[PDB]
Amino acid sequence: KIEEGKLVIWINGDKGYNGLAEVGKKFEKDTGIKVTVEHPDKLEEKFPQVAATGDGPDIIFWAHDRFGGYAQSGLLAEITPDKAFQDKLYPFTWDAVRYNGKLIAYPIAVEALSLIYNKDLLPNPPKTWEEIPALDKELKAKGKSALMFNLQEPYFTWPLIAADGGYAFKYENGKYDIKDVGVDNAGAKAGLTFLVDLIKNKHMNADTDYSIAEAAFNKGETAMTINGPWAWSNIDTSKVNYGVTVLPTFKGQPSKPFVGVLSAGINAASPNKELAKEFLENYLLTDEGLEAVNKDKPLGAVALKSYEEELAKDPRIAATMENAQKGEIMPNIPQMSAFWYAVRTAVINAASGRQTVDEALAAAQTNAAASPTGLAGSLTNALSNGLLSGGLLGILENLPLDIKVTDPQLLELGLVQSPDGHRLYVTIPLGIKLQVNLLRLAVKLDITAEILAVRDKQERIHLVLGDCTHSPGSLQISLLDLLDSLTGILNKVLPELVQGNVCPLVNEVLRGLDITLVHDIVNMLIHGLQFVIKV
Ligand SMILES: CCCCCCCCO[C@@H]1O[C@H](CO)[C@@H](O)[C@H](O)[C@H]1O
Ligand SMILES: [Mg+2]
């Protein structure tokens, strides 16, 4: 139902779709290929629905954070721009469109929060969060306020909270580790305490939301607000004389706002992928193509360097790019929905006093990572938690020859499935620091254990441990601030030593798994179906 020989494009109604249409006219003129621009209501839900029946637009425009979910569902084609083209766009914008090493869409525009200030009230705005209470007192005297912004949404509070070392999920080469959540930390504790202090100290109010902050700033009641480019036109109207600037630092750390990247993906079901590429690369992403769109509805900052250089002559757009460059690309994966909920309740609870700061952050740090996964992830989480409660770390510390063994560690488990799907193999990386006292070393090694399904009694089936054996060449000693003798030595002992203090525990932990997990896993091993992922 998608027609080969034309392009249908979906973009949101708040974007410059008429300008985009003009880009499409130019395209038809050159190629004779017709381009149709639509802005369906809720396209971000519509696209997965129709595209999963093999229908929908050839190209979809949307914030990058949805595209990770679309890629997982097989809805997006991999894009193949050459390196010279990639040099045309800012590198970090390419990271926003990465999924599993692959490029999954063309970056278009860049947006992040900025500090927006009233030049009549505040000709020289503060560079630090810390200055704000002082300003508020002064301004309270004149019947005004220092700072009002939406506290109801963690999107707005995150720049402060994550300022020092904080993150949503950890990024590795266009892969996010959904087990690794950076919510809780000294920065986040300090950052969030400060925010709560401001409410206790009367500088801000906990009930403040988007509409209250916007009115307050747009009526000239408050000197500063925190908002994005979408907010600008309402201020243009308000006759408030305003600047847009770098967010305040907290403890000398830049605020770290989330970055959205408007992006254009290509439908996996499109018969038109090559034309789509041609349109996006040689027509839309050009000084002329972006200008057309921008003149209709302004794009804010853009991913195209040449055009961004022009737009950045507007200090508001330059400030946007600068805040982006100091900010955190929003993870493009669906687990962000747990993250938003965890952080949203935490900040609201701390602000209301329903929880303390450390408590809200501690729950949120756990809750954001709590999204359930398929069999393989479940198994590996299960065994990790098992070994840890089963006291594996303690066992590590207790191995002898001075020495003092320290910093015992379980590392990310590996999982491999038989090509015939009937067999599982787990890798269990382990580590300790050695101290010769002086002379600190890092010892690491793997255990490989086979996981098996077997019938007994004689009908009933069970999940059983195969051979648990120290992986032969896996032992690695690393110097810290004399091998290979030590290694030579250790290889004669550790391997047999570890397996025999460990394999038994591994075997115990296996049995302590949730029973439905066990049954489910057994079932797919029996029938040789692959639940395990190539990495
Ligand atoms: C208002 C719409 C402007 C968007 C078009 C931007 C530039 C397109 O320019 C086109 O590039 C093609 C190859 O790269 C050439 O084949 C065409 O001759 C040229 O017209
Ligand atoms: Mg860059």
UniProtKB/Swiss-Prot annotation:
SUPFAM superfamilies reported in the protein's UniProt record: Periplasmic binding protein-like II
Gene Ontology CC terms: ATP-binding cassette (ABC) transporter complex; ATP-binding cassette (ABC) transporter complex, substrate-binding subunit-containing; maltose transport complex; membrane; outer membrane-bounded periplasmic space; periplasmic space
The keyword Signal belongs to this UniProt entry's keyword annotation: yes
Cytoplasm is among the record's keywords: no
Gene Ontology MF annotations: carbohydrate transmembrane transporter activity; maltose binding
One GO BP annotation of this record: carbohydrate transport
Protein keywords: Periplasm, Signal, Sugar transport, Transport
Triggers of expression: Induced by maltose and the transcriptional regulator MalT. Permanently repressed by cold shock in a PNPase-dependent fashion.
Family label: Belongs to the bacterial solute-binding protein 1 family.
NCBIfam families, per database record: PRK09474.1 (NF007011)
Role, per record: Part of the ABC transporter complex MalEFGK involved in maltose/maltodextrin import. Binds maltose and higher maltodextrins such as maltotriose.
Protein name per UniProt: Maltose/maltodextrin-binding periplasmic protein
